[PDB]
Design a protein around this motif. Structure first.
Motif, PDB file in Angstrom:
ATOM      1  N   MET A   1      21.469  19.871  -2.315  1.00 31.88           N
ATOM      2  CA  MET A   1      20.898  20.737  -1.333  1.00 31.88           C
ATOM      3  C   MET A   1      21.730  22.096  -1.455  1.00 31.88           C
ATOM      4  SD  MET A   1      21.152  20.410   2.677  1.00 31.88           S
ATOM      5  CE  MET A   1      20.259  21.165   4.026  1.00 31.88           C
ATOM      6  N   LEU A   2      22.953  21.679  -1.447  1.00 36.25           N
ATOM      7  CA  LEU A   2      23.908  22.955  -1.611  1.00 36.25           C
ATOM      8  C   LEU A   2      23.974  23.647  -2.981  1.00 36.25           C
ATOM      9  CD1 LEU A   2      27.004  21.419   0.674  1.00 36.25           C
ATOM     10  CD2 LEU A   2      25.811  23.871   0.891  1.00 36.25           C
ATOM     11  N   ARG A   3      23.771  22.712  -3.911  1.00 39.57           N
ATOM     12  CA  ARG A   3      23.499  23.243  -5.097  1.00 39.57           C
ATOM     13  C   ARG A   3      22.245  24.569  -5.396  1.00 39.57           C
ATOM     14  NH1 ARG A   3      22.243  25.854  -8.752  1.00 39.57           N
ATOM     15  NH2 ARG A   3      22.429  25.366 -11.020  1.00 39.57           N
ATOM     16  N   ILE A   4      21.406  24.304  -4.595  1.00 43.21           N
ATOM     17  CA  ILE A   4      20.316  25.134  -4.428  1.00 43.21           C
ATOM     18  C   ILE A   4      20.703  26.345  -3.734  1.00 43.21           C
ATOM     19  CG2 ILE A   4      18.025  25.501  -3.218  1.00 43.21           C
ATOM     20  CD1 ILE A   4      17.337  22.376  -4.159  1.00 43.21           C
ATOM     21  N   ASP A   5      21.051  25.956  -2.462  1.00 37.06           N
ATOM     22  CA  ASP A   5      21.701  27.078  -1.546  1.00 37.06           C
ATOM     23  C   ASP A   5      22.586  28.172  -2.012  1.00 37.06           C
ATOM     24  OD1 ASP A   5      19.670  26.497   0.381  1.00 37.06           O
ATOM     25  OD2 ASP A   5      21.071  25.123   1.375  1.00 37.06           O
ATOM     26  N   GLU A   6      23.756  27.398  -2.884  1.00 30.59           N
ATOM     27  CA  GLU A   6      24.875  28.161  -3.493  1.00 30.59           C
ATOM     28  C   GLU A   6      24.847  28.681  -4.793  1.00 30.59           C
ATOM     29  OE1 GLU A   6      27.198  29.237  -1.425  1.00 30.59           O
ATOM     30  OE2 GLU A   6      26.963  27.783   0.427  1.00 30.59           O
ATOM     31  N   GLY A   7      24.143  28.140  -5.479  1.00 29.47           N
ATOM     32  CA  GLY A   7      23.900  28.428  -6.999  1.00 29.47           C
ATOM     33  C   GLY A   7      25.269  27.711  -7.934  1.00 29.47           C
ATOM     34  N   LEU A   8      25.219  28.209  -8.888  1.00 30.68           N
ATOM     35  CA  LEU A   8      26.422  27.778  -9.878  1.00 30.68           C
ATOM     36  C   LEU A   8      26.738  29.172 -10.956  1.00 30.68           C
ATOM     37  CD1 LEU A   8      28.495  26.036 -11.394  1.00 30.68           C
ATOM     38  CD2 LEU A   8      26.313  25.220 -12.754  1.00 30.68           C
ATOM     39  N   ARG A   9      27.923  29.681 -10.470  1.00 24.92           N
ATOM     40  CA  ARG A   9      28.337  30.526 -11.396  1.00 24.92           C
ATOM     41  C   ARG A   9      29.748  30.333 -11.863  1.00 24.92           C
ATOM     42  NH1 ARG A   9      26.768  36.406  -8.996  1.00 24.92           N
ATOM     43  NH2 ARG A   9      27.072  36.904 -11.219  1.00 24.92           N
ATOM     44  N   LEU A  10      30.049  30.570 -12.968  1.00 26.53           N
ATOM     45  CA  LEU A  10      31.123  30.082 -13.443  1.00 26.53           C
ATOM     46  C   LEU A  10      32.303  31.157 -13.688  1.00 26.53           C
ATOM     47  CD1 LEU A  10      29.887  27.631 -16.593  1.00 26.53           C
ATOM     48  CD2 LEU A  10      30.683  27.250 -14.237  1.00 26.53           C
TER      49      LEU A  10
END
Ligand SMILES: O/N=C\c1cccs1
Length: 163
Positions: free
Chosen positions: A6-15
């Protein structure tokens, strides 16, 4: 679906260090580094969090490690907060995820203005709670995300995320 997805969807992933919706230096899956406008201060926070000289860049594993820590700390914070714990414990598991999501985004300080929403959630007055939650800076600044979290509070289902 679960809190991590859920949070992965809402927050995204940026390195690489980026600015969040509020303009604050952040990395990974919504890991806030600092509210300081100084990029060097953000880089220092990053290095401190990861335990090496990152020069503003981390790996996916490192991002996921911070994410695990951040999710855990968010829940543990709720549990030691006398205002939030009874409401949290009153909820079913899906709605608990909505609570964790909101705290993850806004912090406990941010949730401080939600007293009336909290009361409605504890009363299980779901439509009323949902209406009240949307009367907020939170909603207005991040409406698409807030709508998903609010639907989760309203329904106790993952309908807003299963897409
Ligand atoms: O609604 N946002 C956060 C929380 C609610 C209940 C316990 S934490």
């Amino acid at each position: 679906m679960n809190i991590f997805e859920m949070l992965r969807i809402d927050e995204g992933l940026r390195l690489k260090i980026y600015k969040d919706t509020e303009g604050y230096y952040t990395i990974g899956i919504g890991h806030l580094l600092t509210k300081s406008p100084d990029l060097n201060a953000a880089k220092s926070e990053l290095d401190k969090a990861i335990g090496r000289n990152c020069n503003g860049v981390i790996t996916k594993d490192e991002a996921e490690k911070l994410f695990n820590q951040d999710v855990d700390a968010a829940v543990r914070g709720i549990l030691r907060n006398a205002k939030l714990k009874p409401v949290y414990d009153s909820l079913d598991a899906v709605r608990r995820c909505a609570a964790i999501n909101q705290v993850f985004q806004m912090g406990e300080t941010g949730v401080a203005g939600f007293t009336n929403s909290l009361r409605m959630l504890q009363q299980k007055r779901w439509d009323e709670a949902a209406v009240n939650l949307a009367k907020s800076r939170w909603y207005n600044q991040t409406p698409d995300r807030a709508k998903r979290v609010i639907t989760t509070f309203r329904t106790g289902t993952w309908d807003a995320y299963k897409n």
